[PDB]
Amino acid sequence: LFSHLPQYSLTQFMSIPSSVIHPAMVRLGLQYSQGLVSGSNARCIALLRALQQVIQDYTTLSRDLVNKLKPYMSFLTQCRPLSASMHNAIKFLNKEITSVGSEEAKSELRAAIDRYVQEKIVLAAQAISRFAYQKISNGDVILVYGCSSLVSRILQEAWTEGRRFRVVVVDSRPWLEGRHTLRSLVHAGVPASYLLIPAASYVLPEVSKVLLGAHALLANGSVMSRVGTAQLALVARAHNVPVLVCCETYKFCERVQTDAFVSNELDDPDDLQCKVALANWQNHASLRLLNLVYDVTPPELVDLVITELGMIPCSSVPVVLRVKS
Amino acid sequence: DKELIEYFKSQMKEDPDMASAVAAIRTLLEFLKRIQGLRANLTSAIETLCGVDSSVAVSSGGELFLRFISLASLEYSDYSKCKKIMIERGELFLRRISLSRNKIADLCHTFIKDGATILTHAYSRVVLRVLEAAVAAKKRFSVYVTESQPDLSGKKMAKALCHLNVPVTVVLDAAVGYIMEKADLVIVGAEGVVENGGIINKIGTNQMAVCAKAQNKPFYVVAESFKFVRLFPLNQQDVPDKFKYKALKEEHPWVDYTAPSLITLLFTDLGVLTPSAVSDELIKLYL
Ligand SMILES: O=P(O)(O)OC[C@H]1O[C@](O)(CO)[C@@H](O)[C@@H]1O
Numbered sequence: 354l355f356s357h358l359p360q361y362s363l364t365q366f367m368s369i370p371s372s373v374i375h376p377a378m379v380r381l382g383l384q385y386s387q388g389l390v391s392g393s394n395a396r397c398i399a400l401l402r403a404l405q406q407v408i409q410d411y412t413t414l415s416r417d418l419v420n421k422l423k424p425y426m427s428f429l430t431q432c433r434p435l436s437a438s439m440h441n442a443i444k445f446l447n448k449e450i451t452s453v454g455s456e457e458a459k460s461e462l463r464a465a466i467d468r469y470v471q472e473k474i475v476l477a478a479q480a481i482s483r484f485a486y487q488k489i490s491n492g493d494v495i496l497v498y499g500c501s502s503l504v505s506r507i508l509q510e511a512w513t514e515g516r517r518f519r520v521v522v523v524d525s526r527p528w529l530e531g532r533h534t535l536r537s538l539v540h541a542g543v544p545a546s547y548l549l550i551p552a553a554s555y556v557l558p559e560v561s562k563v564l565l566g567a568h569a570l571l572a573n574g575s576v577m578s579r580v581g582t583a584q585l586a587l588v589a590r591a592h593n594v595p596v597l598v599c600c601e602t603y604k605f606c607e608r609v610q611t612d613a614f615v616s617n618e619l620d621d622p623d624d625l626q627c628k629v630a631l632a633n634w635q636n637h638a639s640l641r642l643l644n645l646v647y648d649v650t651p652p653e654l655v656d657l658v659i660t661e662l663g664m665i666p667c668s669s670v671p672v673v674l675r676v677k678s
Numbered sequence: 679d680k681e682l683i684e685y686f687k688s689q690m691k692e693d694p695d696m697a698s699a700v701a702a703i704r705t706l707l708e709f710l711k712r713i714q715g716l717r718a719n720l721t722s723a724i725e726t727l728c729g730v731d732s733s734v735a736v737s738s739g740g741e742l743f744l745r746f747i748s749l750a751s752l753e754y755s756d757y758s759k760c761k762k763i764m765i766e767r768g769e770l771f772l773r774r775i776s777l778s779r780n781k782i783a784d785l786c787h788t789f790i791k792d793g794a795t796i797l798t799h800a801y802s803r804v805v806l807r808v809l810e811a812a813v814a815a816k817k818r819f820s821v822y823v824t825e826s827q828p829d830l831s832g833k834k835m836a837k838a839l840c841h842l843n844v845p846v847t848v849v850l851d852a853a854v855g856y857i858m859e860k861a862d863l864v865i866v867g868a869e870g871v872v873e874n875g876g877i878i879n880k881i882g883t884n885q886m887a888v889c890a891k892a893q894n895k896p897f898y899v900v901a902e903s904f905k906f907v908r909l910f911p912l913n914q915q916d917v918p919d920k921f922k923y924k925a926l927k928e929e930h931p932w933v934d935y936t937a938p939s940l941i942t943l944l945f946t947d948l949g950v951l952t953p954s955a956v957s958d959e960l961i962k963l964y965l
Pocket residue numbers: 697698799800801802803804805831866867868869879880
């Protein structure tokens with residue numbers, strides 16, 4: 354089954370002027386739980402802004418700040434399981450606090466978040482956009498999947514820098530998230546097409562390249578991302594179309610994983626019933642509703658990783674994990 | 679015994695579009711017009727006809743005719759009545775394979791999508807007929823053809839197919855793996871279909887197929903009914919040296935075996951066939 358991975362449907366116990374967890378961290382955790390903030394980049398930006406709020410309210414430092422904000426990340430692991438972008442952000446923040454030696458260290462810390470967000474989430478996105486501009490030619494059609502803040506940025510800037518392509522947006526239940534791509538494409542004027550994952554093998558005959566987004570690249574080259582990505586890349590290879598995944602460097606986790614079973618958050622199963630024949634699923638004892646959030650595609654199904662350092666073949670992501678550390 | 683070879687060469691001369699095996703059938707049938715020693719004479723005709731052409735189709739097409747007439751001798755026996763039932767049954771066999779290419783074209787031209795881009799090997803009078811029927815059904819496509827050394831039959835096909843107003847490209851013999859992604863489907867004409875459903879075609883057909891399954895392009899074969907030879911190769915050595923050779927050292931085989939796993943479908947005379955289905959038909963063509 355999925356026993357080790359956690360099932361969740363958390364702010365009732367805490368006091369309204371909360372003292373156990375910081376106010377900003379309570380807002381952040383409840384926005385994670387309800388779904389107001391989605392996407393690995395958006396979650397990392399929101400986390401780092403909330404941590405800047407935590408540090409500017411901190412009054413006394415190196416050990417104290419780390420063991421003070423470890424319960425905050427325990428709360429966030431309870432509210433919505435942390436993706437690896439958040440994990441590396443927290444690792445960098447703890448290394449930054451432990452690096453600060455013997456007031457003025459709060460301003461130097463808070464700017465290091467700004468020097469983290471800029472040259473690893475924003476400048477990295479611009480560099481990945483420049484690299485993926487090369488792989489997008491006139492007339493080809495690009496299959497994207499779900500919503501990615503980087504994939505849609507790549508498509509939009511490739512369109513506004515003169516390309517004339519077409520996008521096919523493949524989407525999955527229950528998040529129905531590629532609509533947030535689709536609408537954002539139509540505002541840019543890009544021609545678009547929308548369909549679900551089961552119809553992917555219908556349009557992979559016409560698709561020229563599959564351009565996906567990664568929530569984490571693991572230490573063997575497996576791409577941990579949204580649950581339809583691995584299946585979509587498998588059908589993409591079976592129709593021999595190249596698969597490109599666009600991931601920043603800071604999402605590279607040194608965790609390694611073979612199958613799509615080890616670290617895969619489960620959203621609440623109550624999302625699954627569609628308009629109903631499944632509303633009373635709790636009373637069926639044998640029936641269990643399962644929706645994964647993430648799966649891993651193997652590096653042999655991915656032809657290219659686009660990174661702010663360059664374009665790498667998805668078997669040399671441990672190379673980048675070495676040279677940045 | 680010598681006029682047989684001359685007549686076979688003549689059937690080549692006044693009919694180039696007629697297949698080699700059909701030419702063998704016609705000259706062997708005339709030799710039939712000139713008890714059980716006559717079966718030995720026809721076997722000698724097989725040996726002398728295969729000795730001068732050495733294609734798989736000749737030693738198979740004539741070999742079914744050694745069996746399509748000897749099947750009637752299982753029904754009844756005579757001395758000159760058996761010869762006349764032989765000639766009225768052989769004429770039926772011969773006029774039943776004059777309609778082969780049209781049937782293959784009618785089955786196969788429905789497998790070409792509109793706006794497709796096929797890839798074909800050297801020169802087939804059956805692939806040419808499949809495309810001729812496909813443009814007569816108002817389909818438009820592109821044809822990639824390999825020049826297919828040493829005899830450059832690809833240029834002969836592209837000259838014979840440019841009259842159909844089809845965009846045809848004589849791609850280099852080495853560049854199958856290059857243009858293979860520019861191909862929707864692969865249509866080749868077998869020179870013989872062996873017992874496992876694989877084919878024996880001009881050299882280079884195998885690596886056309888191996889690239890095809892590397893990219894899951896459908897590999898279609900348009901053979902005929904008389905090309906069903908009873909061989910069972912397991913590798914390229916198992917093809918006999920009778921068929922491979924027409925005659926810093928050159929090798930030059932002229933045919934090579936394509937495994938049945940690489941073939942998507944065969945559009946033979948007797949219906950569209952899975953590569954497995956061929957084996958059944960071979961059993962039925964030899965009891
Ligand atoms: O279609 P045809 O002319 O009967 O022969 C089919 C195959 O035999 C060859 O003519 C000779 O092997 C090949 O060019 C062709 O692929």
